Design a protein around this ligand. Sequence first.
Ligand SMILES: C[C@H](NC(=O)N[C@H]1[C@H]2C[C@@H]3C[C@@H](C[C@H]1C3)C2)C(=O)N1CC[C@H](c2ccccc2Cl)N1c1ccccc1F
Ligand SMILES: [Zn+2]
Length: 664
Amino acid sequence: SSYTAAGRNVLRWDLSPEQIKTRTEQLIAQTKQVYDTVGTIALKEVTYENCLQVLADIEVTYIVERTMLDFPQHVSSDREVRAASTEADKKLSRFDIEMSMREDVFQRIVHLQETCDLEKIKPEARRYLEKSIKMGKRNGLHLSEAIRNEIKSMKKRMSELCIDFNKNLNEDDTSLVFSKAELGALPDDFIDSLEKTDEDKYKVTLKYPHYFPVMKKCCVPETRRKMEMAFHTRCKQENTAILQQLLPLRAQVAKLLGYNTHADFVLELNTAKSTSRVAAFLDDLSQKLKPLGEAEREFILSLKKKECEERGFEYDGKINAWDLHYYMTQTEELKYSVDQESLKEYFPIEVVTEGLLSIYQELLGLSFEQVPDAHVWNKSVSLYTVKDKATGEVLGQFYLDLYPREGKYNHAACFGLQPGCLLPDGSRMMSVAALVVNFSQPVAGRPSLLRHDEVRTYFHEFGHVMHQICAQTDFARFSGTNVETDFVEVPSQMLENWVWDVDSLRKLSKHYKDGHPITDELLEKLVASRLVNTGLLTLRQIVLSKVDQSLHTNATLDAASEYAKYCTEILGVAATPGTNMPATFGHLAGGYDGQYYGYLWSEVFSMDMFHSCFKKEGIMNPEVGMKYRNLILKPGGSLDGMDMLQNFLQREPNQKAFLMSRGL
Ligand SMILES: C[C@H](NC(=O)N[C@H]1[C@H]2C[C@@H]3C[C@@H](C[C@H]1C3)C2)C(=O)N1CC[C@H](c2ccccc2Cl)N1c1ccccc1F
Ligand SMILES: [Zn+2]
């Protein structure tokens, strides 16, 4: 029955470190047997059934069992359990590298593609075939046993380099000391939170919750100059030496695999296809954003002439790198004047939850229902069952993990826990997602309360949840959010547009003391502040995108001298002499190198689908809402991103609604 939820979630969240250890050993041994069975099938004897189907069946089985093993490390309250889960994940990733080089299994399905008729199977089954083979050729399984052994060795070193790149940055404990006057305009809240030293000064570390208040609030420009120099010289000379190995290594592995650059290797699985497509996209957007950034630099500079005159400071006549977050925060509090704290009194969390669940149910045609006596990894976690309003089909379930505790993931995320694919016995699996965020912890005084940028995160992360749950595919590889990486953030960013709508904000806002709405003047101050500092904030995302694209196109360039080049040519705010920002850029050694363009790439598509389709036909209209559910969310990764796009807009998308978003 695809019309109940009973029996369909049996994920266990109370596993002991011993249970995790042994389930990990048993899953590796059992999955290996299937690979082993396939790889010794005579080529005369292979079928769709005994190669491609047994591979898909073990892939679903692998994914679900893995979730019980690698997810406790992110949400559990027992440290011994989070540690078994971290070790399981390491041991299971060791197993995946091993499986990625199984040429015996790769040879069996190349043969199947060679013989069997491609037009007597399902289009998605054809896709599972073609992309499993493309997978093995992107690992070089079709190549000789000699460069493969060398490619294997080269990749194990990239792994070491990437580990050490971030381990360096995380083991850093660089601090400056300051006085109460050298920390001007910073709140008593922030300064009471700081340690004091033996010469009775205030210790400010270089970590994110210390660095960013100071750069945004401190009225002493020399304190800002010192903190920015320290911030962008973190692991300066040792992470430069890692990039000098890692980036040419990516160029070399890619050329062995038949790709010109590492960026080309990455982009093949993306909707932007090529490096020149990305390059022109990024270049023709800075030419677009140029006079808007010329206007913003002009205004910020005049704020600085004003300020230095009043405070008794010298005026150099530039916006330095340690001056930008300061006067952008002034711009936010001078032009647009939204108190982001008297506004947070209007968003209590019972109300935001209830009216976010209201919007999506009405828009997509769904029915959410909380599970009573629910198995959970924590007491504070809820469970909802998701139905289709018309049929009563149970599509899936989402957990809501809202509040911060020790051991918990401290970023916002949607974890897919179960794929909405087919099961080996012909049946359908229920989708299971987890919304994991850290909204401000409830204290016995008032209700827990949300800032507007927290409502924006709630909404962003719930469209991932709906993408995961509404998706229905035949194979687990295409299930849920498993689309292109420059497309994963379209269903998320598109629904952020709702928290910038007047009518919709009223469904979320209710003062926690009576229940009188936000007034009209405040609601209008709000949605007018959508494009504060847009130019200089968007030009700085392009700088980082041009940087990520450059180091994976020409690996013979100084990373710091490229960052300097883009900072002055695109941003208009110069990189500081002596700094090395790319040596602190954790994305280059995170999993998404060559992929930074894809968050501006994805905004254009969601701006098009919102302005040309939703804003036009009514943004709560359940006919655009069902067409969005069916032609974007439902097919998952079983169709291409630009095809799902054109089935909806009924045309190739353009940047017009994106330029009209920013106001150009
Ligand atoms: C890196 C690894 N690559 C291959 O296994 N490549 C083979 C070789 C190269 C091509 C062709 C053939 C199948 C696949 C793709 C051999 C991989 O993707 N793994 C590791 C086991 C699991 C899996 C993948 C595919 C089918 C079944 C399973 Cl259990 N899968 C996996 C791991 C973590 C999460 C989700 C997953 F799905
Ligand atoms: Zn996201």
